[PDB]
Amino acid sequence: PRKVLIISAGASHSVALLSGDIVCSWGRGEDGQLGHGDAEDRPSPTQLSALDGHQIVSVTCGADHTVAYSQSGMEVYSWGWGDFGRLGHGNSSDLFTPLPIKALHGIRIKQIACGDSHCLAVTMEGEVQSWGRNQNGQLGLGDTEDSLVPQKIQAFEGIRIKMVAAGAEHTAAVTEDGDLYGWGWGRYGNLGLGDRTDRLVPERVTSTGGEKMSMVACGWRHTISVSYSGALYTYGWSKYGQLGHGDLEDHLIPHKLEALSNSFISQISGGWRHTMALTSDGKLYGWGWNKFGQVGVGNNLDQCSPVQVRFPDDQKVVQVSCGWRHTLAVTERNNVFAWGRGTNGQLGIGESVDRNFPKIIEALSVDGASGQHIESSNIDPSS
Amino acid sequence: PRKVLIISAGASHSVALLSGDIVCSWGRGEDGQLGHGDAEDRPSPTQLSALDGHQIVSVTCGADHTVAYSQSGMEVYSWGWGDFGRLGHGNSSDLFTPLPIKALHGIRIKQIACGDSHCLAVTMEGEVQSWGRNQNGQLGLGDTEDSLVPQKIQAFEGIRIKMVAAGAEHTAAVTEDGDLYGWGWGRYGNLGLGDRTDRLVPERVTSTGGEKMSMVACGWRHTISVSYSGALYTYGWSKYGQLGHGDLEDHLIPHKLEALSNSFISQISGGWRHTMALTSDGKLYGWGWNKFGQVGVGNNLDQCSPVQVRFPDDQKVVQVSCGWRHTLAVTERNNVFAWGRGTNGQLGIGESVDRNFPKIIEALSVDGAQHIESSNIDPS
């Protein structure tokens, strides 16, 4: 019966929104990021009962916290690790069950990005509010003091923002008109501004291959964008080849990934040390650090150039999301796959070793012989 | 029949040095912090074979990395999560097996402290070198750029340092003559300097009532010191009551813990959000965040004043080390106990739920025994 609408991966956890107004989560539970009230890891997708009936329309993971929002309810919810104010409730308290971010009540939300310890929300009118750690200017407020509550980014006054993205300690955004911005911790060139200097307010990227940009995403210390013509650009850290240019060189400005130049990129995701890109014809390409199999190409060797991730019967991919050591994807057939590190249960396939090529999550998928059952949190996850 | 000489706890792992100069480790293995060459958690104490025969005399855990040194070998080793240069090898590579910090070769080491992502070593001549993340000045080098290799702290020229300590992003030290210093991230008052501002070089804590400090330790965002008279001082963050003053107030300068004024504190340790102090007569007191039972008092309720941790037959405690969510201790009977969060195997008692009061580690104890395991064993 239930379709997977949205998937998101955090550092060691995974969250999905399903049709029928249901959120589920699995993986590491130690900081409360799963939202079930307890602190235990969940190796199988588990219904987040506190959100039943809340008409949630989106979920987004940060490293060790989760955010979700309801259009109808006019509410944004957060839970997980609370340090530095990343949950936005005016304190640093962890939450093991979702609580509304009261400052955002009644605000019409378009999109939310979560990094390691900061978050941002774009409104329907293209305004941006940010909160959390700000030691390197990543909130975009023009200082270096953390904020425990959402703050309007005054620098974007009179500019319609389309989407935001957030890494460990940096932030990026694209406007509706195609401009690309970067701010925060900039030491690995990850802002795309041609230097290694932090920025306390958003600064526009001027080296964009002459192109307007339609989307952006952040990995831990790297950044990915897609241009109006569907070309893919990466910048920042490439120690593990996560920039995908066939070498291990950092780039301080956006650098077009030439190997994918004949494809039109439709979705992008940045992991800890790896990267995913989805083409308009449904082909998924992964690259970067592959120690735990998170690139999904059937080995544990790092990949400094894009390699297509393969699925049964070559079924097309429609969604992808990178965690720190795992990756999740949804296919056209409404199957959900996961691969990579499995030690916290983040793959959602029950108790399992790590996987280096895509494995179907039976509880969430049409196929797999059984489209099994998401579990109640009252089930003991160690049993 | 092997005595446990030193215990040290990291965020989610545990390391010990045994007689015969044997190193063992257990708990979270994902970042290489156990040093066995694989990435798997170890729920039981496991011999770190790469250090067999290296005559290691000390081990020290950071959050997700570990350091050790040999006097005879004149060598310092590090392994685990490599980002920001915390391992000190001139790169950002993680290490799943110990490698020597070549910059420290041939230097006589007195003590090493490890924080979240920076480390410091004190030499036998009282000089200090630091390395790792420096975004908030925690290296004490006068800037905010990370260092992938050890660097001398010039600010201490002419000052003989006795011991150092490191938290998440801050650092503290005491001199041989009892002066106390702090530097790095200072937003919760944890530097002890009377404000909430960072420092980029070491600065002396001038408000100690003229009292000299024999030792200092750091928790994640709090700091603990002991005077030459054995008085316990805490400062910094007390959101979880980890300063132990019977309330939840931060303190910007060192503050005497009045409730223990009749005891002489011999050892101290700071955890993520909890604290341990050991008296000269072997009584262990814990306080702070207790969600996972890490305070060791038989429940899961936070404690904002010291409570004595009880052991079987009231056996005296001789060593204690706080992790992020667990605690380790060694007793007079050569028994080793662990308590708190157990999900990564950090308690070392085999696969286990969390524990809220001390549980014996059979592999390392007299009361006590199974044995330490080879890394070849399947931990699953």
From Swiss-Prot, chain B:
RCC1 repeats lie at residues 1-18, 19-71, 73-124, 126-176, 177-228, 230-280, 281-332, 334-380. It is found in: Nucleus; Cytoplasm, Cytosol. Disruption phenotype: Hypersensitivity to ultraviolet-B (UV-B) illumination. Abrogated induction of DHU1 in response to UV-B. Disruption in a plant lacking DHU1 alleviates its hypersensitivity to UV-B. Changing residue 287 to A: No effect on function, homodimerization and interaction with COP1. Changing residue 289 to A: No effect on function, homodimerization and interaction with COP1. PROSITE patterns: RCC1_2, RCC1_3. InterPro entries: RCC1/BLIP-II, Reg_chr_condens, Ub_ligase/GEF_domain. Changing residue 339 to A: Cannot interact with COP1. Changing residue 270 to E: In uvr8-5; loss of response to UV-B. Coiled coil: none annotated. The keyword Phosphoprotein does not apply. Changing residue 324 to A: Reduces response to UV-B. The keyword Chloroplast does not apply. Changing residue 79 to A: No effect on function, homodimerization and interaction with COP1. PANTHER family: REGULATOR OF CHROMOSOME CONDENSATION (PTHR22870), ULTRAVIOLET-B RECEPTOR UVR8 (PTHR22870:SF360). Homodimer in the absence of UV-B, but absorption of UV-B induces monomerization of UVR8 and interaction with COP1. Interacts with RUP1, RUP2 and histone H2B. This is Ultraviolet-B receptor UVR8. It comes from Arabidopsis thaliana. The gene is UVR8.
